[PDB]
Amino acid sequence: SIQAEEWYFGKITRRESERLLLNAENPRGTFLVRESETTKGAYCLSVSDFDNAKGLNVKHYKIRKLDSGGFYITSRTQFNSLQQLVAYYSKHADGLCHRLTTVCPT
Fold this sequence. Notes:
Layout: E1 8-10, H1 14-21, E2 31-35, E3 43-51, E4 55-65, E5 71-72, E6 78-79, H2 82-89
Parallel strand pairs: 1-2
Antiparallel strand pairs: 2-3, 3-4, 4-5, 5-6
PDB class: signaling protein
Keywords: SH2 domain fragment approach, signaling protein
Assembly: monomeric
């Protein structure tokens, strides 16, 4: 069940994800997964970052789920579930701003 996952915030907007993730206590890679505002059926992975150019900021990545079944940010790297996707990006930064670290406090 993706609901019940503690990093799943469901139906919260992009601005709300930023409100939550822009807290100075959050390290790089603090993150949550929410519904997409623009794509039905898709999700957004919202991730905090920090650099001396930008300070604290947030990136959003769309996660699609095919009817054939896989979950992905890039179709070149698919997962059998949202959990395994989250599990993989918590170990590999790849094209993300930072590898996933901590679940966003509420």
